[PDB]
Design an enzyme around this catalytic site. Structure first.
Site, PDB file in Angstrom:
ATOM      1  N   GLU A 234      18.706  15.330  30.394  1.00 34.25           N
ATOM      2  CA  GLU A 234      20.269  14.423  29.214  1.00 34.25           C
ATOM      3  C   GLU A 234      21.260  14.571  30.533  1.00 34.25           C
ATOM      4  OE1 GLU A 234      18.354  15.154  24.659  1.00 34.25           O
ATOM      5  OE2 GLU A 234      21.241  15.108  25.407  1.00 34.25           O
TER       6      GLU A 234
ATOM      7  N   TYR B 167      25.855  10.968  29.061  1.00 32.07           N
ATOM      8  CA  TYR B 167      25.471  10.137  27.865  1.00 32.07           C
ATOM      9  C   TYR B 167      23.621   9.495  28.229  1.00 32.07           C
ATOM     10  CZ  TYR B 167      25.762   5.553  31.397  1.00 32.07           C
ATOM     11  OH  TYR B 167      25.074   4.475  32.702  1.00 32.07           O
TER      12      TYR B 167
ATOM     13  N   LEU C 186      12.322   9.212  41.349  1.00 33.37           N
ATOM     14  CA  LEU C 186      12.222  10.591  42.471  1.00 33.37           C
ATOM     15  C   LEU C 186      12.006  12.086  41.662  1.00 33.37           C
ATOM     16  CD1 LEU C 186      15.064   8.318  43.126  1.00 33.37           C
ATOM     17  CD2 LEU C 186      14.906  10.487  45.452  1.00 33.37           C
TER      18      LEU C 186
ATOM     19  N   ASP D 193      30.931  13.880  39.114  1.00 33.71           N
ATOM     20  CA  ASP D 193      29.866  14.601  38.295  1.00 33.71           C
ATOM     21  C   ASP D 193      28.786  15.217  39.760  1.00 33.71           C
ATOM     22  OD1 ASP D 193      29.129  16.317  36.866  1.00 33.71           O
ATOM     23  OD2 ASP D 193      28.175  14.662  35.660  1.00 33.71           O
TER      24      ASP D 193
ATOM     25  N   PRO E 280      24.399  19.847  41.381  1.00 35.77           N
ATOM     26  CA  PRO E 280      23.346  19.729  42.418  1.00 35.77           C
ATOM     27  C   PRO E 280      21.770  18.882  40.957  1.00 35.77           C
ATOM     28  CG  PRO E 280      23.605  21.846  42.933  1.00 35.77           C
ATOM     29  CD  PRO E 280      24.559  21.367  41.998  1.00 35.77           C
TER      30      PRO E 280
HETATM   31  N1  LIG Z   1      13.991  18.379  36.233  1.00 41.31           N
HETATM   32  S1  LIG Z   1      13.382  18.266  38.082  1.00 41.31           S
HETATM   33  O1  LIG Z   1      13.350  18.613  38.432  1.00 41.31           O
HETATM   34  O2  LIG Z   1      11.688  18.021  37.738  1.00 41.31           O
HETATM   35  C1  LIG Z   1      13.589  16.374  37.974  1.00 41.31           C
HETATM   36  C2  LIG Z   1      14.499  15.743  38.089  1.00 41.31           C
HETATM   37  C3  LIG Z   1      14.649  14.099  38.423  1.00 41.31           C
HETATM   38  C4  LIG Z   1      13.772  13.925  38.415  1.00 41.31           C
HETATM   39  N2  LIG Z   1      13.690  11.979  38.483  1.00 41.31           N
HETATM   40  C5  LIG Z   1      14.843  11.937  38.413  1.00 41.31           C
HETATM   41  N3  LIG Z   1      15.628  11.891  37.399  1.00 41.31           N
HETATM   42  C6  LIG Z   1      17.076  11.088  37.246  1.00 41.31           C
HETATM   43  O3  LIG Z   1      17.795  11.502  36.381  1.00 41.31           O
HETATM   44  C7  LIG Z   1      17.818  12.821  35.784  1.00 41.31           C
HETATM   45  C8  LIG Z   1      18.328  13.272  35.646  1.00 41.31           C
HETATM   46  C9  LIG Z   1      18.518  14.422  34.064  1.00 41.31           C
HETATM   47  C10 LIG Z   1      19.510  15.220  33.466  1.00 41.31           C
HETATM   48  C11 LIG Z   1      20.420  15.177  34.581  1.00 41.31           C
HETATM   49  C12 LIG Z   1      20.909  14.004  35.371  1.00 41.31           C
HETATM   50  C13 LIG Z   1      19.907  13.252  35.414  1.00 41.31           C
HETATM   51  C14 LIG Z   1      16.924  10.216  38.070  1.00 41.31           C
HETATM   52  N4  LIG Z   1      17.818   8.618  37.388  1.00 41.31           N
HETATM   53  C15 LIG Z   1      17.412   7.897  38.375  1.00 41.31           C
HETATM   54  N5  LIG Z   1      16.592   8.444  39.381  1.00 41.31           N
HETATM   55  C16 LIG Z   1      15.859   9.157  38.546  1.00 41.31           C
HETATM   56  N6  LIG Z   1      14.511   9.901  38.768  1.00 41.31           N
HETATM   57  C17 LIG Z   1      11.927  13.941  38.334  1.00 41.31           C
HETATM   58  C18 LIG Z   1      12.261  15.677  38.060  1.00 41.31           C
END
Ligand SMILES: NS(=O)(=O)c1ccc(Nc2nc(OCC3CCCCC3)c3nc[nH]c3n2)cc1
Lengths: 258, 294
Positions: free
Chosen positions: B13, B16, B80, B124, B127
């Site tokens: 999350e 939003y 990703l 924002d 990492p």
């Molecule tokens: N935890 S993790 O490291 O295992 C891992 C991380 C992110 C993803 N993949 C991924 N995530 C998104 O939003 C992640 C979102 C989470 C809450 C904070 C802001 C961003 C995306 N938005 C477009 N494409 C996206 N792809 C897969 C595995």
């Protein structure tokens, strides 16, 4: 001057062409007319004054309206609902603190319901395919202001007044891009207050000259003259205020000489 | 509808909505799905969508589709594999190779430069908001706090940037802030990539200012004109000395140090920009290494 001014200006110049509505859309609208649009736009100036909204919000709203009407037929009784959704969306986009939907239902005087205003918001979004970052006359003027030598607050206020008058009359202003409406607005303002002209530096930045801006400059000169007689008076009223240095009260020049 | 999409798992999350990992039943394409519950359409979604449709760049997360059904709004994204924070935590015993920090920073700046060139502030950068594939690319994600700015800027929402990455000019409540806030965030992340701990992990606004001051020196009028006249400047601020950048991020190149000291300059105007940063001698030997991850 930052490092993105030229990049942004260039990009904004590209984007106005893509965000342009259709020029003859009113001739394709069976039930609505230029005069009715004038009424809606004027009402939004009232709305923006009521809730102390940024002028940018106003231009965005009008852009949204015109782009929506370039593809969707609307009856007279519903034009104001379209107008209200536009203003709402523009607010959500541009404002730090937009007004509640509830506050928007109130200013329509309970013509439309909350559910109606919400469903229209979607429709607009969808019809505009969610593309809402449109360049405005306002966005160009603020860049143009940087070329004042020196800065004059009365020039800026007058420029924004004139630019805002272009929003009312689709005939002719729809046939002009914002960057051009702003050049006309900036020069006219600048010539009225200080008796100076479009700056050479702005020629270097924009590619526009007095010769190239002249067609629009002639039209805007007429609007300015007929403004105190204009059926819609909200913008004139707005710009009497000290916030805008009472620029609407100023005497327009009778000749530009070119 | 989402007839064609099968949810695999929740992933987070941010700002939003909620992001799910999902799979296209018909194409096979793994995607990310941002779900929004429907006071109208949120201001944050309106901005994220229109701006992300404008921003097409290898280092900016691709928006694929926008779906309705109601009362939900689905955003469909390229998937990703991992965010930077998880990757940093996976690299705890072994380290992150300098050529990969280099590549990552280089890519991030490209993507930031694209944004700024299209009148867009991220606001924002952290990492958890940076995603990486197995092929070696890093991308900016979560444009919820993003906003299209104008030239020159007017005052914007003061809330912005999650604490640890928040630029001093916001902290001290300057009335205007610009592209320099994204550089600041990127500078902290640069350090964090090298040291694998956050640079200034404050718990309150004042904590943060103090942590920054202990690292960069309490600023004065000489180092940052107008600072003692800022709304949240207090004369009672402890006056810490500046320390050598060699002690702030000990493993770093002379050119790394140069680059970093420029991304963390107090004065937002003096602070190097993304565009200019790409020309920095730090990147002379830059390549594109894969992260070697699982
Ligand atoms: N935890 S993790 O490291 O295992 C891992 C991380 C992110 C993803 N993949 C991924 N995530 C998104 O939003 C992640 C979102 C989470 C809450 C904070 C802001 C961003 C995306 N938005 C477009 N494409 C996206 N792809 C897969 C595995």
């Amino acid at each position: 001057v930052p490092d993105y001014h030229e990049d942004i200006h260039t990009y904004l110049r590209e984007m106005e062409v893509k965000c342009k509505p259709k020029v003859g859309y009113m001739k394709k609208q069976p039930d609505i007319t230029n005069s009715m649009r004038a009424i809606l736009v004027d009402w939004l100036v009232e709305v923006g004054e009521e809730y102390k909204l940024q002028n940018e919000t106003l231009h965005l709203a009008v852009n949204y309206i015109d782009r929506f009407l370039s593809s969707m037929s609307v009856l007279r009784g519903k034009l104001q609902l379209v107008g209200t959704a536009a203003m709402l969306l523009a607010s959500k986009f541009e404002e730090i603190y937009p007004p509640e939907v509830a506050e928007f239902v109130y200013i329509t005087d309970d013509t439309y319901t909350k559910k109606q205003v919400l469903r229209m918001e979607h429709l607009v979004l969808k019809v505009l395919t969610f593309d809402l970052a449109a360049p405005t006359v306002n966005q160009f003027l603020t860049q143009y202001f940087l070329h004042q030598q020196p800065a004059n607050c009365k020039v800026e206020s007058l420029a924004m007044f004139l630019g805002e008058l272009s929003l009312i009359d689709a005939d002719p202003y729809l046939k002009y891009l914002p960057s051009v409406i702003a050049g006309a607005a900036f020069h006219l303002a600048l010539y009225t207050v200080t008796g100076q002209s479009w700056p050479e530096s702005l020629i270097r930045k924009t590619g526009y000259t007095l010769e190239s801006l002249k067609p629009c400059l002639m039209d805007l000169h007429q609007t300015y003259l007929k403004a105190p007689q204009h059926a819609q008076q909200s913008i004139r009223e707005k710009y009497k205020n000290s916030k805008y240095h009472g620029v609407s009260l100023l005497n327009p020049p009778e000749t530009l000489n070119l | 509808s989402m007839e064609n999409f099968q949810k695999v798992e929740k992933i987070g999350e941010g700002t939003y909505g909620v992001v799910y990992k999902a799979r296209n039943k018909l194409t096979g394409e793994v995607v990310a799905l941002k779900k929004i519950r429907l006071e109208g359409v949120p201001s944050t979604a309106i901005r994220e969508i229109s701006l992300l449709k404008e921003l097409n760049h290898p280092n900016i997360v691709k928006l694929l589709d926008v779906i309705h059904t109601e009362n939900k709004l689905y955003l469909v994204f390229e998937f990703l594999s991992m965010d930077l924070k998880d990757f940093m935590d996976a690299s705890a015993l072994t380290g992150i190779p300098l050529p990969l920090i280099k590549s990552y920073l280089f890519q991030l700046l490209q993507g930031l430069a694209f944004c700024h060139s299209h009148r867009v502030l991220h606001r924002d950068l952290k990492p958890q908001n940076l995603l990486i594939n197995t092929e070696g690319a890093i991308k900016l994600a979560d444009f919820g706090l993003a906003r299209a700015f104008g030239v020159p800027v007017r005052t914007y929402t003061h809330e912005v940037v999650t604490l640890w990455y928040r630029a001093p000019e916001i902290l001290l409540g300057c009335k205007y802030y610009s592209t320099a806030v994204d550089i600041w965030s990127l500078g902290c992340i640069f350090a964090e990539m090298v040291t694998r701990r956050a640079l200034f992990p404050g718990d309150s606004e004042i904590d943060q200012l103090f942590r920054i001051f202990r690292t960069l020196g309490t600023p004065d009028e000489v180092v940052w004109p107008g600072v003692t006249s800022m709304p949240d400047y207090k004369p009672s601020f402890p006056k810490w000395a500046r320390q050598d950048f060699s002690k702030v991020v000990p493993p770093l190149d002379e050119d790394g140090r140069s680059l970093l000291s420029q991304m963390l300059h107090y004065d937002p105007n003096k602070r190097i920009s993304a565009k200019a940063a790409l020309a920095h001698p730090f990147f002379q030997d830059v390549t594109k290494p894969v992260p070697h991850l699982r």
